[PDB]
Write a protein of this length. Structure first.
Ligand SMILES: O=C(O)Cc1cccc(CNC(=O)c2ncnc3ccsc23)c1
Length: 167
């Protein structure tokens, strides 16, 4: 029994809710929040810009030190950093950005990173400004992630379509 509330159950291990992931993180303070990162950990916009803003830019400062030491992530890769005021940990996961011509097949690899964590609060990878079809992202999530994932979908009309079209 954990502290997530108001989610619709899609499968044995995948749950979904129409929510702002920032507000959900501040309310639940989960062990792991997933960021929709890019390989440079430049948290400008979308989920990343919103999470970073909620940390008063501390996420960006930590991220810049990580990149200065380690170099960029891979598309499909991840790193674990602090969750600051929002979570114990932030798992920064890089889904492919369709708007940059990255291979959508890397979306499955991106979701595999979730399996290293028992429970996560997460957005749909490669959705929103990353340009992939969110219905496809949800299907890859369900078919790839085996740990317990609580998906926060910002847009209510998308959250209604995702739930109504779910197989
Ligand atoms: O909500 C999120 O977490 C990510 C997000 C945030 C803002 C705007 C979008 C873009 N909207 C959509 O892709 C969308 N909307 C409504 N019906 C559909 C049906 C197929 S795509 C689609 C996505």
């Amino acid at each position: 029994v954990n502290s997530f509330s108001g989610y619709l159950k899609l499968t044995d291990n995948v749950y979904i809710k129409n929510a702002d992931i920032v507000e959900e993180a501040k309310k639940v303070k989960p062990t792991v929040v997933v960021n929709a990162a890019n390989v440079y950990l430049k948290h400008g916009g979308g989920v990343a810009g919103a999470l970073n803003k909620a940390t008063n830019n501390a996420m960006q400062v930590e991220s810049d030190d990580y990149i200065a030491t380690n170099g960029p992530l891979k598309v499909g890769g991840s790193c674990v950093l602090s969750g600051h005021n929002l979570a114990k940990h932030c798992l920064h996961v890089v889904g492919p950005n369709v708007n940059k011509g990255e291979d959508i097949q890397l979306l499955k690899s991106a979701y595999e990173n979730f399996n290293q964590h028992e429970v996560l609060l997460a957005p749909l990878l490669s959705a929103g400004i990353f340009g992939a079809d969110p219905i496809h992202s949800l299907r890859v999530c369900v078919d790839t992630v085996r740990t317990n994932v609580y998906l926060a979908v910002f847009d209510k009309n998308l959250y209604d379509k995702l739930v109504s079209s779910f197989l």
